[PDB]
């Protein structure tokens, strides 16, 4: 019963993620800095303020956007960073 | 050829050997794959 439950929980997980928005376009070069606004000692370096050139509704138009990421989700390449998933898998 | 890499913005220059039967001349050095005008290839 444990093997069937394991299989069914994984199956339901994948069924739920399957129809959701794909984030493949986000595996682009990020330009990140440290978040230093009211940062406690325990959180220094934990949040990265990453800017990037993102696509828009139209393929010929771009937008410059930023997002905060946790240190564990962003890996340094060569202030240039990439998501940890860029060399392993597409993320949904 | 110029093909994408792990990141969508950065591109890379790579090479590969192909058999004549798989490559069709376009336009001496410019070629495309025979599948380019009929179907995506898996």
């Amino acid at each position: 019963m444990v093997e069937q439950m394991h299989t069914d929980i994984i199956s339901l997980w994948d069924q739920s993620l399957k129809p959701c928005v794909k984030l493949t376009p986000l595996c682009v070069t990020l330009q990140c800095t440290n978040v230093t606004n009211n940062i406690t000692d325990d959180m220094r370096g934990e949040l990265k303020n990453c800017s990037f050139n993102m696509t828009t509704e139209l393929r010929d138009k771009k937008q410059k956007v930023y997002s905060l990421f946790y240190r564990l989700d962003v890996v340094q390449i060569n202030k240039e960073y990439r998501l940890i998933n860029c060399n392993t898998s597409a993320i949904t | 050829f110029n093909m994408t890499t792990e990141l969508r913005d950065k591109k890379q220059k790579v090479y590969s050997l192909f058999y004549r039967l798989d490559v069709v001349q376009i336009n001496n050095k410019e070629y495309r794959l025979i599948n380019c005008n009929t179907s995506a290839i898996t």
């Binding site: 376009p25 050139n53 696509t55 771009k62 | 110029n2 969508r8 913005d9 591109k11 890379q12 220059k13």
Partner: protein, 41 residues
């Protein structure tokens, strides 16, 4: 040396361009074409 400095623009493996490299193309967002690189020795 062949520094491949990309004096002005984003440096992508097939070229340098003032406007950045387009994620959905093999060109640059507004610039379309890639610029040659400057080299030093």
């Amino acid at each position: 040396n062949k520094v491949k400095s990309c004096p002005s623009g984003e440096d992508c493996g097939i070229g340098c361009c003032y406007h950045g490299c387009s994620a959905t193309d093999y060109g640059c967002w507004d610039g379309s074409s890639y610029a040659p690189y400057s080299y030093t020795y």
